[PDB]
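Hello,

Following up on my earlier ticket. Below are the two sequence lines again, exactly as submitted.
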Amino acid sequence: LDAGTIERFLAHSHRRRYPTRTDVFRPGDPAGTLYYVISGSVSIIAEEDDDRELVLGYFGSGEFVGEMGLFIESDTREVILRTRTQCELAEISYERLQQLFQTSLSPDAPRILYAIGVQLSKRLLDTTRKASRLAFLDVTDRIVRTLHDLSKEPEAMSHPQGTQLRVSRQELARLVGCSREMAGRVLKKLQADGLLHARGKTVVLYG
Amino acid sequence: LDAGTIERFLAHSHRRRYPTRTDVFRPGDPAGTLYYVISGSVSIIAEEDDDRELVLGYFGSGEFVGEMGLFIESDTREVILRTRTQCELAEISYERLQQLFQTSLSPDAPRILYAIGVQLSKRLLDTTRKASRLAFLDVTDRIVRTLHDLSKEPEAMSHPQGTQLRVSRQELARLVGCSREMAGRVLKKLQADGLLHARGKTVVLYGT
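Thanks for your patience. The regenerated structure is below:
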Protein backbone atom coordinates (compact mmCIF):
# COMPACT_ATOMS: atom_id res chain seq x y z
CA LEU A 1 0.00 0.00 0.00
CA ASP A 2 1.72 3.17 -1.25
CA ALA A 3 1.59 6.60 0.40
CA GLY A 4 -0.85 7.95 -2.17
CA THR A 5 -3.42 5.19 -1.84
CA ILE A 6 -3.20 5.63 1.93
CA GLU A 7 -3.64 9.41 1.91
CA ARG A 8 -6.45 9.19 -0.66
CA PHE A 9 -8.27 6.65 1.53
CA LEU A 10 -7.78 8.77 4.67
CA ALA A 11 -9.29 11.89 3.09
CA HIS A 12 -12.76 10.35 3.48
CA SER A 13 -11.98 8.93 6.93
CA HIS A 14 -12.79 10.42 10.32
CA ARG A 15 -9.76 10.74 12.59
CA ARG A 16 -10.30 10.29 16.35
CA ARG A 17 -7.93 10.24 19.33
CA TYR A 18 -8.31 7.48 21.95
CA PRO A 19 -6.89 7.20 25.49
CA THR A 20 -5.12 4.00 26.49
CA ARG A 21 -6.94 0.94 27.90
CA THR A 22 -10.01 1.91 25.90
CA ASP A 23 -12.39 -0.61 24.32
CA VAL A 24 -13.17 0.81 20.87
CA PHE A 25 -15.85 -1.86 20.54
CA ARG A 26 -16.86 -5.15 22.17
CA PRO A 27 -18.79 -8.26 21.06
CA GLY A 28 -22.35 -7.31 20.19
CA ASP A 29 -21.69 -3.73 19.17
CA PRO A 30 -23.03 -2.49 15.84
CA ALA A 31 -20.60 -3.52 13.09
CA GLY A 32 -20.74 -0.75 10.53
CA THR A 33 -17.33 0.86 10.43
CA LEU A 34 -13.75 0.14 9.45
CA TYR A 35 -10.80 1.51 11.47
CA TYR A 36 -7.26 2.25 10.23
CA VAL A 37 -4.56 2.64 12.88
CA ILE A 38 -2.72 5.90 12.24
CA SER A 39 -0.71 5.90 15.46
CA GLY A 40 -0.51 3.87 18.63
CA SER A 41 -1.09 0.20 19.26
CA VAL A 42 -4.25 -1.85 19.78
CA SER A 43 -5.18 -5.41 20.66
CA ILE A 44 -7.85 -7.83 19.43
CA ILE A 45 -9.33 -9.97 22.19
CA ALA A 46 -11.67 -12.96 22.21
CA GLU A 47 -14.14 -12.95 25.07
CA GLU A 48 -15.75 -15.88 26.87
CA ASP A 49 -19.03 -16.35 28.78
CA ASP A 50 -17.24 -16.04 32.12
CA ASP A 51 -15.53 -12.80 31.11
CA ARG A 52 -12.25 -14.63 30.46
CA GLU A 53 -10.06 -13.17 27.71
CA LEU A 54 -7.83 -14.62 24.99
CA VAL A 55 -5.58 -11.98 23.41
CA LEU A 56 -5.23 -12.74 19.71
CA GLY A 57 -2.67 -10.07 18.78
CA TYR A 58 -1.25 -6.54 18.74
CA PHE A 59 -1.63 -4.10 15.87
CA GLY A 60 0.06 -0.82 15.04
CA SER A 61 0.19 1.84 12.30
CA GLY A 62 -1.11 0.86 8.88
CA GLU A 63 -3.32 -1.91 10.23
CA PHE A 64 -7.01 -2.13 9.37
CA VAL A 65 -9.18 -3.41 12.20
CA GLY A 66 -12.91 -3.92 12.59
CA GLU A 67 -12.74 -5.03 8.98
CA MET A 68 -14.65 -8.33 9.22
CA GLY A 69 -18.03 -6.70 8.63
CA LEU A 70 -16.69 -5.48 5.27
CA PHE A 71 -16.52 -9.13 4.25
CA ILE A 72 -19.05 -10.98 6.42
CA GLU A 73 -22.67 -9.83 6.54
CA SER A 74 -23.20 -9.07 10.24
CA ASP A 75 -24.87 -6.55 12.54
CA THR A 76 -22.45 -7.26 15.36
CA ARG A 77 -18.72 -7.32 16.25
CA GLU A 78 -17.30 -10.68 17.32
CA VAL A 79 -14.30 -9.41 19.32
CA ILE A 80 -13.03 -6.66 21.61
CA LEU A 81 -10.76 -3.98 20.08
CA ARG A 82 -8.75 -2.38 22.88
CA THR A 83 -6.11 0.35 22.96
CA ARG A 84 -2.76 -0.55 24.51
CA THR A 85 -1.40 2.99 24.12
CA GLN A 86 -2.80 6.41 23.34
CA CYS A 87 -4.19 6.06 19.81
CA GLU A 88 -5.28 7.90 16.68
CA LEU A 89 -7.66 5.89 14.50
CA ALA A 90 -9.24 6.77 11.16
CA GLU A 91 -12.75 5.40 10.59
CA ILE A 92 -15.14 5.06 7.66
CA SER A 93 -18.45 3.24 7.33
CA TYR A 94 -18.59 0.09 5.19
CA GLU A 95 -21.34 1.54 3.00
CA ARG A 96 -19.41 4.70 2.28
CA LEU A 97 -16.22 2.72 1.63
CA GLN A 98 -17.84 0.35 -0.86
CA GLN A 99 -19.54 3.34 -2.47
CA LEU A 100 -16.10 4.91 -2.89
CA PHE A 101 -14.84 1.63 -4.38
CA GLN A 102 -17.44 1.95 -7.17
CA THR A 103 -16.39 5.55 -7.84
CA SER A 104 -13.73 7.81 -6.29
CA LEU A 105 -11.41 5.12 -4.91
CA SER A 106 -12.23 2.80 -7.80
CA PRO A 107 -8.52 2.81 -8.80
CA ASP A 108 -7.29 1.90 -5.28
CA ALA A 109 -9.85 -0.84 -4.67
CA PRO A 110 -7.41 -3.59 -5.70
CA ARG A 111 -4.63 -2.17 -3.49
CA ILE A 112 -6.72 -1.63 -0.39
CA LEU A 113 -8.27 -5.06 -0.89
CA TYR A 114 -4.92 -6.81 -1.34
CA ALA A 115 -3.47 -5.03 1.69
CA ILE A 116 -6.39 -6.13 3.90
CA GLY A 117 -5.79 -9.62 2.54
CA VAL A 118 -2.18 -9.40 3.69
CA GLN A 119 -3.23 -8.62 7.25
CA LEU A 120 -6.01 -11.19 7.33
CA SER A 121 -3.46 -13.76 6.13
CA LYS A 122 -0.96 -12.80 8.81
CA ARG A 123 -3.71 -12.94 11.41
CA LEU A 124 -5.01 -16.28 10.19
CA LEU A 125 -1.45 -17.68 10.41
CA ASP A 126 -0.79 -16.39 13.93
CA THR A 127 -4.25 -17.47 15.08
CA THR A 128 -3.79 -20.86 13.43
CA ARG A 129 -0.53 -21.20 15.40
CA LYS A 130 -2.16 -20.02 18.63
CA ALA A 131 -4.88 -22.69 18.19
CA SER A 132 -2.22 -25.42 17.68
CA ARG A 133 -0.27 -24.37 20.75
CA LEU A 134 -3.41 -24.21 22.87
CA ALA A 135 -4.27 -27.78 21.87
CA PHE A 136 -0.85 -29.43 22.08
CA LEU A 137 1.52 -27.38 24.28
CA ASP A 138 1.78 -27.07 28.06
CA VAL A 139 1.53 -23.57 29.51
CA THR A 140 5.31 -23.31 29.97
CA ASP A 141 5.92 -23.99 26.26
CA ARG A 142 3.22 -21.56 25.20
CA ILE A 143 4.77 -18.88 27.39
CA VAL A 144 8.33 -19.40 26.16
CA ARG A 145 7.28 -19.28 22.46
CA THR A 146 5.13 -16.22 23.20
CA LEU A 147 8.03 -14.43 24.90
CA HIS A 148 10.08 -15.16 21.78
CA ASP A 149 7.48 -13.76 19.38
CA LEU A 150 7.16 -10.65 21.48
CA SER A 151 10.93 -10.22 21.29
CA LYS A 152 10.77 -10.40 17.46
CA GLU A 153 8.41 -7.40 17.38
CA PRO A 154 9.99 -4.01 16.49
CA GLU A 155 8.79 -2.94 19.95
CA ALA A 156 11.43 -5.25 21.43
CA MET A 157 13.82 -2.83 23.19
CA SER A 158 17.41 -4.18 23.23
CA HIS A 159 19.30 -5.13 26.40
CA PRO A 160 22.90 -6.17 27.19
CA GLN A 161 21.73 -9.72 28.05
CA GLY A 162 19.39 -10.08 25.10
CA THR A 163 15.99 -8.55 24.42
CA GLN A 164 14.04 -6.45 26.93
CA LEU A 165 10.33 -7.19 26.46
CA ARG A 166 7.39 -5.28 27.91
CA VAL A 167 4.70 -7.65 29.22
CA SER A 168 2.83 -7.98 32.52
CA ARG A 169 1.78 -11.17 34.32
CA GLN A 170 -1.82 -10.35 33.39
CA GLU A 171 -1.21 -9.88 29.65
CA LEU A 172 1.01 -12.95 29.50
CA ALA A 173 -1.89 -14.79 31.09
CA ARG A 174 -4.21 -13.33 28.45
CA LEU A 175 -1.90 -14.32 25.60
CA VAL A 176 -1.69 -18.00 26.49
CA GLY A 177 -5.00 -18.59 28.17
CA CYS A 178 -3.76 -19.43 31.65
CA SER A 179 -4.41 -17.82 35.04
CA ARG A 180 -2.42 -14.77 36.15
CA GLU A 181 -0.90 -16.75 39.00
CA MET A 182 0.17 -19.60 36.73
CA ALA A 183 1.86 -17.05 34.46
CA GLY A 184 3.58 -15.66 37.53
CA ARG A 185 4.68 -19.16 38.50
CA VAL A 186 6.05 -19.98 35.04
CA LEU A 187 8.03 -16.73 34.97
CA LYS A 188 9.84 -17.52 38.23
CA LYS A 189 10.70 -20.99 36.91
CA LEU A 190 12.19 -19.60 33.70
CA GLN A 191 14.15 -17.03 35.73
CA ALA A 192 15.41 -19.72 38.11
CA ASP A 193 16.26 -21.59 34.91
CA GLY A 194 18.53 -18.74 33.88
CA LEU A 195 16.57 -18.02 30.70
CA LEU A 196 15.50 -14.56 31.78
CA HIS A 197 14.60 -12.28 34.64
CA ALA A 198 11.57 -10.09 35.31
CA ARG A 199 10.51 -6.87 37.03
CA GLY A 200 6.92 -5.66 37.22
CA LYS A 201 6.11 -5.17 33.53
CA THR A 202 9.67 -5.74 32.30
CA VAL A 203 10.91 -9.15 31.17
CA VAL A 204 14.50 -9.39 29.99
CA LEU A 205 14.69 -12.37 27.65
CA TYR A 206 18.23 -13.70 27.25
CA GLY A 207 19.62 -14.37 23.78
CA LEU B 1 -17.90 -13.11 -7.62
CA ASP B 2 -19.94 -14.21 -10.66
CA ALA B 3 -19.71 -17.29 -12.87
CA GLY B 4 -18.21 -15.09 -15.56
CA THR B 5 -15.28 -13.98 -13.45
CA ILE B 6 -14.85 -17.57 -12.28
CA GLU B 7 -14.71 -19.10 -15.76
CA ARG B 8 -12.18 -16.60 -17.06
CA PHE B 9 -10.13 -17.29 -13.96
CA LEU B 10 -10.25 -21.02 -14.70
CA ALA B 11 -9.43 -20.49 -18.38
CA HIS B 12 -5.81 -20.05 -17.25
CA SER B 13 -5.82 -22.83 -14.65
CA HIS B 14 -4.80 -26.48 -14.72
CA ARG B 15 -7.62 -28.71 -13.46
CA ARG B 16 -6.47 -31.96 -11.86
CA ARG B 17 -8.45 -34.76 -10.21
CA TYR B 18 -7.31 -35.98 -6.78
CA PRO B 19 -8.15 -39.23 -4.98
CA THR B 20 -9.64 -39.03 -1.47
CA ARG B 21 -7.34 -39.04 1.59
CA THR B 22 -4.65 -37.38 -0.49
CA ASP B 23 -2.58 -34.70 1.23
CA VAL B 24 -2.25 -32.22 -1.67
CA PHE B 25 0.61 -30.48 0.19
CA ARG B 26 2.21 -30.62 3.64
CA PRO B 27 4.13 -28.05 5.69
CA GLY B 28 7.49 -27.61 3.99
CA ASP B 29 6.49 -28.00 0.36
CA PRO B 30 7.14 -25.22 -2.14
CA ALA B 31 4.43 -22.56 -2.09
CA GLY B 32 4.07 -21.04 -5.52
CA THR B 33 0.58 -22.31 -6.26
CA LEU B 34 -2.98 -21.31 -5.44
CA TYR B 35 -5.81 -23.84 -5.46
CA TYR B 36 -9.49 -23.40 -6.27
CA VAL B 37 -11.79 -26.23 -5.18
CA ILE B 38 -13.96 -27.05 -8.20
CA SER B 39 -15.56 -30.12 -6.68
CA GLY B 40 -14.91 -32.20 -3.63
CA SER B 41 -14.20 -31.61 0.02
CA VAL B 42 -10.78 -30.80 1.50
CA SER B 43 -9.48 -30.06 4.96
CA ILE B 44 -6.82 -27.65 6.20
CA ILE B 45 -4.76 -29.21 8.97
CA ALA B 46 -2.00 -27.80 11.19
CA GLU B 47 0.77 -29.95 12.64
CA GLU B 48 2.71 -29.71 15.89
CA ASP B 49 5.91 -31.41 17.00
CA ASP B 50 4.68 -34.39 19.03
CA ASP B 51 3.16 -35.28 15.67
CA ARG B 52 -0.39 -34.17 16.36
CA GLU B 53 -2.97 -32.71 13.98
CA LEU B 54 -5.68 -30.08 14.37
CA VAL B 55 -8.30 -29.74 11.64
CA LEU B 56 -8.90 -26.02 11.16
CA GLY B 57 -11.78 -26.53 8.77
CA TYR B 58 -13.45 -28.21 5.82
CA PHE B 59 -14.01 -26.49 2.52
CA GLY B 60 -16.10 -27.19 -0.55
CA SER B 61 -16.74 -25.94 -4.06
CA GLY B 62 -15.78 -22.31 -4.62
CA GLU B 63 -13.05 -22.20 -1.98
CA PHE B 64 -9.57 -20.82 -2.59
CA VAL B 65 -7.02 -22.85 -0.64
CA GLY B 66 -3.24 -22.62 -0.37
CA GLU B 67 -3.60 -18.88 -0.82
CA MET B 68 -1.23 -17.72 1.92
CA GLY B 69 1.85 -17.44 -0.30
CA LEU B 70 -0.13 -15.06 -2.52
CA PHE B 71 -0.07 -12.59 0.38
CA ILE B 72 2.87 -13.51 2.57
CA GLU B 73 5.88 -14.23 0.39
CA SER B 74 7.07 -17.56 1.75
CA ASP B 75 9.02 -20.42 0.24
CA THR B 76 6.96 -23.04 2.06
CA ARG B 77 3.48 -24.15 3.17
CA GLU B 78 2.48 -23.88 6.82
CA VAL B 79 -0.42 -26.35 6.82
CA ILE B 80 -1.72 -29.61 5.34
CA LEU B 81 -4.29 -29.56 2.53
CA ARG B 82 -6.04 -32.95 2.57
CA THR B 83 -8.89 -34.15 0.34
CA ARG B 84 -11.76 -35.66 2.35
CA THR B 85 -13.40 -37.03 -0.79
CA GLN B 86 -12.43 -37.32 -4.44
CA CYS B 87 -11.72 -33.78 -5.66
CA GLU B 88 -11.27 -31.60 -8.72
CA LEU B 89 -8.88 -28.72 -8.00
CA ALA B 90 -7.82 -26.00 -10.41
CA GLU B 91 -4.33 -24.71 -9.69
CA ILE B 92 -2.47 -21.60 -10.87
CA SER B 93 0.94 -20.24 -9.90
CA TYR B 94 1.01 -17.01 -7.91
CA GLU B 95 3.46 -15.40 -10.33
CA ARG B 96 1.19 -16.06 -13.30
CA LEU B 97 -1.82 -14.86 -11.34
CA GLN B 98 -0.63 -11.32 -10.59
CA GLN B 99 0.83 -11.18 -14.10
CA LEU B 100 -2.73 -11.95 -15.19
CA PHE B 101 -3.97 -9.44 -12.59
CA GLN B 102 -2.03 -6.85 -14.59
CA THR B 103 -3.31 -8.06 -17.98
CA SER B 104 -6.51 -9.79 -19.17
CA LEU B 105 -7.63 -10.30 -15.54
CA SER B 106 -7.08 -6.77 -14.19
CA PRO B 107 -10.87 -6.09 -14.27
CA ASP B 108 -11.49 -9.29 -12.33
CA ALA B 109 -8.81 -8.48 -9.72
CA PRO B 110 -11.21 -6.51 -7.48
CA ARG B 111 -13.78 -9.33 -7.34
CA ILE B 112 -11.12 -12.01 -6.94
CA LEU B 113 -9.29 -10.34 -4.04
CA TYR B 114 -12.58 -9.50 -2.34
CA ALA B 115 -13.80 -13.09 -2.63
CA ILE B 116 -10.54 -14.31 -1.10
CA GLY B 117 -11.02 -11.64 1.54
CA VAL B 118 -14.44 -13.08 2.37
CA GLN B 119 -12.94 -16.53 2.72
CA LEU B 120 -9.99 -15.36 4.79
CA SER B 121 -12.43 -13.55 7.08
CA LYS B 122 -14.59 -16.62 7.69
CA ARG B 123 -11.60 -18.81 8.54
CA LEU B 124 -10.15 -16.17 10.83
CA LEU B 125 -13.46 -15.92 12.66
CA ASP B 126 -13.72 -19.73 12.81
CA THR B 127 -10.12 -20.23 13.98
CA THR B 128 -10.41 -17.39 16.47
CA ARG B 129 -13.37 -19.26 17.93
CA LYS B 130 -11.44 -22.53 17.99
CA ALA B 131 -8.53 -21.02 19.89
CA SER B 132 -11.02 -19.56 22.35
CA ARG B 133 -12.52 -23.02 22.84
CA LEU B 134 -9.17 -24.82 23.09
CA ALA B 135 -8.29 -22.35 25.83
CA PHE B 136 -11.37 -22.34 28.08
CA LEU B 137 -13.61 -25.33 27.29
CA ASP B 138 -13.10 -28.96 28.32
CA VAL B 139 -12.61 -31.86 25.91
CA THR B 140 -16.03 -33.48 26.37
CA ASP B 141 -17.45 -29.98 26.10
CA ARG B 142 -15.68 -29.25 22.79
CA ILE B 143 -16.63 -32.65 21.37
CA VAL B 144 -20.35 -32.13 22.07
CA ARG B 145 -20.26 -28.72 20.39
CA THR B 146 -18.48 -30.17 17.33
CA LEU B 147 -20.93 -33.09 17.11
CA HIS B 148 -23.72 -30.55 16.68
CA ASP B 149 -21.84 -28.50 14.07
CA LEU B 150 -21.66 -31.58 11.86
CA SER B 151 -25.34 -32.39 12.41
CA LYS B 152 -25.90 -29.25 10.37
CA GLU B 153 -23.39 -30.40 7.77
CA PRO B 154 -25.00 -31.22 4.40
CA GLU B 155 -23.54 -34.69 4.98
CA ALA B 156 -25.66 -35.24 8.08
CA MET B 157 -27.89 -38.15 7.08
CA SER B 158 -31.10 -37.94 9.16
CA HIS B 159 -31.85 -40.98 11.37
CA PRO B 160 -34.96 -42.30 13.23
CA GLN B 161 -33.06 -41.66 16.48
CA GLY B 162 -31.58 -38.31 15.55
CA THR B 163 -28.92 -37.72 12.91
CA GLN B 164 -26.34 -40.08 11.43
CA LEU B 165 -22.99 -38.28 11.33
CA ARG B 166 -20.09 -40.20 9.83
CA VAL B 167 -17.00 -39.03 11.71
CA SER B 168 -14.11 -41.35 12.59
CA ARG B 169 -12.70 -41.34 16.13
CA GLN B 170 -9.46 -40.09 14.59
CA GLU B 171 -11.07 -37.06 12.91
CA LEU B 172 -13.05 -36.20 16.04
CA ALA B 173 -9.82 -36.05 18.02
CA ARG B 174 -8.26 -33.95 15.25
CA LEU B 175 -11.25 -31.61 15.34
CA VAL B 176 -11.25 -30.82 19.06
CA GLY B 177 -7.51 -31.18 19.52
CA CYS B 178 -7.33 -34.27 21.72
CA SER B 179 -5.83 -37.77 21.54
CA ARG B 180 -7.62 -40.32 19.35
CA GLU B 181 -8.00 -42.28 22.58
CA MET B 182 -9.47 -39.55 24.81
CA ALA B 183 -11.92 -38.78 22.02
CA GLY B 184 -13.02 -42.39 22.38
CA ARG B 185 -13.47 -42.16 26.14
CA VAL B 186 -15.95 -39.33 25.57
CA LEU B 187 -17.80 -41.09 22.76
CA LYS B 188 -18.48 -44.03 25.05
CA LYS B 189 -19.33 -41.81 28.03
CA LEU B 190 -21.85 -40.13 25.73
CA GLN B 191 -23.08 -43.55 24.55
CA ALA B 192 -23.81 -44.23 28.22
CA ASP B 193 -25.22 -40.81 29.08
CA GLY B 194 -27.88 -41.60 26.46
CA LEU B 195 -27.54 -39.07 23.67
CA LEU B 196 -25.74 -40.90 20.84
CA HIS B 197 -24.70 -44.34 19.58
CA ALA B 198 -21.00 -44.96 18.83
CA ARG B 199 -21.48 -47.13 15.73
CA GLY B 200 -18.00 -48.29 14.67
CA LYS B 201 -17.27 -45.66 12.02
CA THR B 202 -20.42 -43.56 12.31
CA VAL B 203 -22.20 -41.65 15.10
CA VAL B 204 -25.95 -41.39 15.61
CA LEU B 205 -26.49 -38.24 17.67
CA TYR B 206 -29.83 -38.64 19.42
CA GLY B 207 -32.09 -35.64 19.12
CA THR B 208 -30.81 -33.09 16.61
